[PDB]
C-alpha cells in the first residue's frame, strides 16, 4: 504493497525530473492557494 | 499598512518584494473574513484594492525582464 | 566539524542544553551545507555556476533575489516601521 | 556525471528515510539557522 504519503512526493518528483522539469522548493509566505505562489503568477 | 508598503516599494522599480508583501496583505483580509467582522459593502473596497494593486505590480515584472535581454530564451511562431 | 579535503562542510553536536533545563536523553544533530558541498564536489569556484539540474544554474535562479534583496536588508529597509515592529 | 543540486537532495533525503528518519518540510517563517526551527528547539 500500500502506498504511503512520504513516498509519493518521491514518486512525483522523480518523474517530473525525467521529463524535464526543475523541481524547487515550497512557498515562504503563507499562500491562500497553490496559484498565487510569485514562483507561477510571475 | 502592508498595502501602502507594496505601493512604496512598487513605484521604485522593485518587483519582487512588491509582490511578496501583497501575499501578506491578502492572508490578512483572508484571516478577517474568518473571523466574522467583514460587511458586505466593505468585500467589494478589498477586492478592489487587492485587484489593482495585483494588476499595477504584475505589469511591472515583463518591463524588468525585457531589459534583460531575456537570457532564458525567446518563443516564435 | 568535518574537513572533507580541507573545507568544513559539515556541523556535528550532542546537545546538552535548551532553553535553560537540562537535556535527558541528549539529542545529536547533524547539518549538512549545501552549497558548500556542491562547489566542491563540482570543481567551481563561484555560486553562480553551480549546476541546479540539467540545463539551468544556481545564479539564473536566485542570483537578483541575491542582489535585491540585499539592497532590501542593507540600505533601503524602513529602520522605524521595525523598531516598532519588535515591541 | 557528476551530483547536481537536486540530486543531492534528493539522494540525502531517501538515504535519511532508509534509516528511519522522518522527512518533514521546512518552515514559514524567516529564520537564521536551523537548530531554532520550531521543530528542533522545542
Redesign the interface.
Known amino acids: 504493497s500500500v502506498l504511503t504519503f ?1 513516498q509519493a512526493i ?1 514518486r512525483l ?2 518523474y517530473w ?1 525525467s521529463v ?1 522539469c ?11 492557494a497553490g496559484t ?1 505562489n ?1 514562483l507561477t ?2 | 499598512d502592508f498595502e501602502e508598503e507594496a505601493r512604496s516599494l512598487l513605484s521604485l522599480w522593485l ?2 518584494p512588491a ?2 508583501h501583497v ?2 496583505a ?2 490578512a483580509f ?1 484571516i478577517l473574513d474568518s473571523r466574522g467582522f467583514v460587511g458586505v459593502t466593505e468585500r467589494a473596497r478589498y477586492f478592489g484594492r487587492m485587484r489593482s494593486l495585483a494588476r499595477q505590480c ?1 505589469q511591472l ?1 515583463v518591463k524588468t525582464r525585457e531589459n534583460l535581454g531575456y537570457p532564458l530564451g525567446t518563443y516564435q511562431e | 566539524e568535518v574537513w572533507m579535503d580541507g573545507m568544513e562542510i559539515t556541523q556535528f553536536t550532542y546537545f546538552q542544553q535548551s532553553g535553560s533545563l537540562p537535556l535527558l536523553p541528549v539529542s545529536v544533530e547533524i547539518t549538512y551545507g549545501l552549497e558548500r558541498i556542491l562547489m566542491s564536489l563540482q570543481g567551481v569556484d563561484h555560486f553562480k555556476n553551480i549546476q ?5 544554474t544556481y545564479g539564473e ?1 536566485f542570483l537578483e533575489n541575491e542582489k535585491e534583496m540585499s539592497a532590501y536588508y542593507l540600505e533601503h529597509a524602513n529602520v522605524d516601521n521595525i523598531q516598532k515592529h519588535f515591541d
Open positions: 512520504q518521491q518528483q522523480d525530473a524535464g526543475a523541481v524547487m522548493q515550497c512557498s515562504n509566505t503563507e499562500v491562500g498565487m510569485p503568477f510571475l | 518587483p519582487i509582490y511578496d501575499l501578506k491578502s492572508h483572508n504584475a515584472w | 541546479y539540474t540539467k540545463g539551468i535562479l
